[PDB]
Amino acid sequence: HKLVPLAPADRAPAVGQFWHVTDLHLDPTYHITDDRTKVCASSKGANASNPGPFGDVLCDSPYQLILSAFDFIKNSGQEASFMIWTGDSPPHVPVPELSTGTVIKVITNMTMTVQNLFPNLQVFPALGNHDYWPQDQLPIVTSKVYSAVADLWKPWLGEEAISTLKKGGFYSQKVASNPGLRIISLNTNLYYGPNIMTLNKTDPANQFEWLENTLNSSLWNKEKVYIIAHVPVGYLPYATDTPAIRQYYNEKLLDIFRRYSSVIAGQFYGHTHRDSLMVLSDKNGNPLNSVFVAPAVTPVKGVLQKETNNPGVRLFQYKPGDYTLLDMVQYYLNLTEANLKGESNWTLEYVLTQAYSVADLQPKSLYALVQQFATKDSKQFLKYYHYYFVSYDSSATCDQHCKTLQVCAIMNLDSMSYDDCLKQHL
Ligand SMILES: *[C@@H]1O[C@H](CO)[C@@H](O[C@@H]2O[C@H](CO)[C@@H](O[C@@H]3O[C@H](CO[C@H]4O[C@H](CO)[C@@H](O)[C@H](O)[C@@H]4O)[C@@H](O)[C@H](O[C@H]4O[C@H](CO)[C@@H](O)[C@H](O)[C@@H]4O)[C@@H]3O)[C@H](O)[C@H]2NC(C)=O)[C@H](O)[C@H]1NC(C)=O
Ligand SMILES: *[C@@H]1O[C@H](CO[C@@H]2O[C@@H](C)[C@@H](O)[C@@H](O)[C@@H]2O)[C@@H](O[C@@H]2O[C@H](CO)[C@@H](O)[C@H](O)[C@H]2NC(C)=O)[C@H](O)[C@H]1NC(C)=O
Ligand SMILES: *[C@@H]1O[C@H](CO[C@@H]2O[C@@H](C)[C@@H](O)[C@@H](O)[C@@H]2O)[C@@H](O[C@@H]2O[C@H](CO)[C@@H](O)[C@H](O)[C@H]2NC(C)=O)[C@H](O)[C@H]1NC(C)=O
Ligand SMILES: *[C@@H]1O[C@H](CO)[C@@H](O[C@@H]2O[C@H](CO)[C@@H](O)[C@H](O)[C@H]2NC(C)=O)[C@H](O)[C@H]1NC(C)=O
Ligand SMILES: *[C@@H]1O[C@H](CO)[C@@H](O)[C@H](O)[C@H]1NC(C)=O
Ligand SMILES: [Zn+2]
Ligand SMILES: [Zn+2]
Numbered sequence: 543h544k545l546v547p548l549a550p551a552d553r554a555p556a557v558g559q560f561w562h563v564t565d566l567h568l569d570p571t572y573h574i575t576d577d578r579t580k581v582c583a584s585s586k587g588a589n590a591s592n593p594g595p596f597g598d599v600l601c602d603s604p605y606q607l608i609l610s611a612f613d614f615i616k617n618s619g620q621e622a623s624f625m626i627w628t629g630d631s632p633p634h635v636p637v638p639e640l641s642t643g644t645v646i647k648v649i650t651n652m653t654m655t656v657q658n659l660f661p662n663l664q665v666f667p668a669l670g671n672h673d674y675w676p677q678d679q680l681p682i683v684t685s686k687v688y689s690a691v692a693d694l695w696k697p698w699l700g701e702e703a704i705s706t707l708k709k710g711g712f713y714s715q716k717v718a719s720n721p722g723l724r725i726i727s728l729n730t731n732l733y734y735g736p737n738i739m740t741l742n743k744t745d746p747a748n749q750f751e752w753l754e755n756t757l758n759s760s761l762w763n764k765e766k767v768y769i770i771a772h773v774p775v776g777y778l779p780y781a782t783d784t785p786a787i788r789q790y791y792n793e794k795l796l797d798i799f800r801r802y803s804s805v806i807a808g809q810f811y812g813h814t815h816r817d818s819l820m821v822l823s824d825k826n827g828n829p830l831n832s833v834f835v836a837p838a839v840t841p842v843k844g845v846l847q848k849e850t851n852n853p854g855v856r857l858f859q860y861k862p863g864d865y866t867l868l869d870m871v872q873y874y875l876n877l878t879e880a881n882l883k884g885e886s887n888w889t890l891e892y893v894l895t896q897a898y899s900v901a902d903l904q905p906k907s908l909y910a911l912v913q914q915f916a917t918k919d920s921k922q923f924l925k926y927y928h929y930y931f932v933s934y935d936s937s938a939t940c941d942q943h944c945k946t947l948q949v950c951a952i953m954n955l956d957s958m959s960y961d962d963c964l965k966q967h968l
Contacts, residue, residue: 557859557868558720561615561625564772564812565670565838568648569602569633584633588845594881599850602633603840608652610875611839611855612659614888618873620857623719625663627656628812629670629731629772632677634842642675646690649673653694664718665698667691668727669711670772670813671734678736680729682747684709710747714756714767723807723865724760726753728771730811733791750794757802766807766865774811774835775799776820777960779930779951780944786813789957796822796956803830807865808858808903811835815842815851817872817929821909822955829905833955834858834870837932841877852877852932854891867903870894874932891933898922912952923949943968 571583578589582601590598596607615625632640632648656665671678674687681688692699692708703713711729731737732746740746760767775795778784785792799806799822809822809831820833836856843850852874859869872891880886894900900907915923927940927948940948950963 555862556621558862558865559620559622560858560860561622562628562810562834562836562856562858563611563615563625563839564628564836565630565815565840566608566652567602567630567633567672567838567840567842568605568608568652569635570605570648571633572597572601572604582633583635583639584842586635592878592881594877595884596875596877596880596886597841597853599841599843599877600845602842603853607853607875608655608839610880610886610888611853612655614873614886615855616659622663622857624717624725625656625660625665626725626768626770626810627665627667628770628810628836629668630672630812630838631670632672634672637676640675640677642686645673645675646687649687649691650694653691657697665695666715666717666725666727666770667695667698668770668772669729669731671731671736673772674731678731678734679739680711680731680737681739682710682732682743687711706752710749710752712747712749712752716765720862720865722765722863724756724765724767726756726767726769728753728769730771730773730775730787730795733787733795734773735788750798753795754798757798757805761802761805765805767802767805768865769799769806769809771811773813774818774820774833775809775822776833776955777951778814779816779818779948782947783961783964785957793956800824800830806831807860808867809833812838815840817851817854817932819908819912819926819952820955821905821912821953823905823909823953823959825959827959829909832867832903832905832908834903837872837874841934849931849935849938852934854932855888868895870903872929872932876933892929897925897929909953912949915952916949 569582569584581590581593584602585600631652674680692704703715706713714726717723732740815838817837818835822831823829837851837854839853854874857871874891946967954960954963
């Protein structure tokens, strides 16, 4: 007779879960026609290679492909308390074939698709570099796109998040279903090389100052943070000595993340359209923070490229009330198979702990895995390289130079450590 909260049984709490989707790249022009140069504007006049209802490797996503991905999530039987959605909704077409209004229409379509299918799910979006017109020119002051997405994302975001989004394309937001957890959604397109609007700016849109203040507040309020953004930190794994964002910004952002590694329980990016790991470490090689780059829904590639990805979506598992990452489940669509029979079969690609025999996703666990990758003829690395393209090509091989670039990028996010790795291993 005393109104005490009812104690849960002595069972183990279920893990928490969230989805990560990215790089949808809807092409509304997609249609099958005999002249394969007219299947999709995103192929820019190339003949689509072998187009079907779920897309083509030379095209961005048909609406049916995106719908199949979200329908899979909806019908998966997995519980999830939120979703993160890291940008890039319009297709790869020349700048004159788009407009601000068209970009907003595509982002609206994707947002409303998600809201329609998941009415009870809090979603945390980030802007991508194609989420603006012209592409990549994301500004340092308010804009029609920033205002539009603040309006579109109001169902998921509080007043303060809406205000920062409208001004600079970034926000932080407490996760309603997960007390103690905050999402920081950065606009890393401000740091992306093609952005003329931020040339020579030390702190475009004051995002670094804002990020430092936000992380310091989380530190003192005993929160944990998941960082989400479109373009990742670190180095491109397929090129030599090329930071994904401008070096000055990569160095500066990584310094903030090292300083706040104790608060940051995960970092989640897109843009690359590949499945990559990174481990942020200190200058002496001690692991600090795990970084997860998710592959795209779109399977697009250019004609010059040999490989591409299969469509992917992924799920993370975390410790409730603590937010340590426990696992990652990557799902995919075998696009060739789905197009041949005309039916999608979104399916499990791998569970990270099972694929790699690691205990969890903590920095020390993943650092040890990457040390295994570095061993000669590592079977773990062979598996990783197959998963990098979401199992698009089981015969893809990574020669010595290719492997050095991959492992160096996985392990070394800043210039000094990356270049030292090249020195040792080229
Ligand atoms: C996603 O779904 C696709 C579609 O099903 C799968 O791709 C098929 O994979 C099968 C099995 O690997 C392929 O069949 C094999 O092809 C080998 C030849 O490789 C390439 O060369 C031909 C040109 O001659 C290409 O046209 C072809 O598409 C391949 O890209 C052959 O060596 C195999 O022959 C032998 O295989 C076994 C013995 O191992 C026996 O059963 C056979 O009798 C024969 O002895 C075999 O034919 C098939 O070609 C692929 N199709 C396409 C369209 O690519 C993917 O594997 C799947 N992805 C995942 C991750 O599962
Ligand atoms: C796009 O493809 C068309 C068609 O290519 C032909 O059909 C395919 C199914 C395949 O079998 C190809 O090897 C064929 O060539 C191209 O148009 C044809 O191009 C060839 C060579 O220039 C020519 O002999 C034909 O007369 C052309 N027209 C047709 C109707 O066949 C076209 O060049 C391709 N465009 C691009 C940008 O690649
Ligand atoms: C990071 O924050 C600490 C703590 O400041 C507090 O943070 C919140 C809880 C909020 O309630 C603020 O009003 C608090 O002040 C900052 O520490 C302060 O530093 C000044 C020196 O400049 C010192 O005089 C105060 O006593 C400190 N406060 C406490 C509680 O120790 C710190 O400056 C912030 N760091 C950065 C880089 O911004
Ligand atoms: C998002 O866009 C797709 C098309 O690009 C829409 O689906 C099409 O809707 C029109 C009517 O508006 C139909 O004529 C098409 O046949 C539909 N299907 C396809 C595959 O094109 C979809 O309605 C839009 N969704 C939202 C929420 O706006
Ligand atoms: C769907 O994909 C996977 C293959 O990895 C498998 O679980 C299932 O059997 C596939 N579909 C059918 C019809 O078998
Ligand atoms: Zn993209
Ligand atoms: Zn991008």
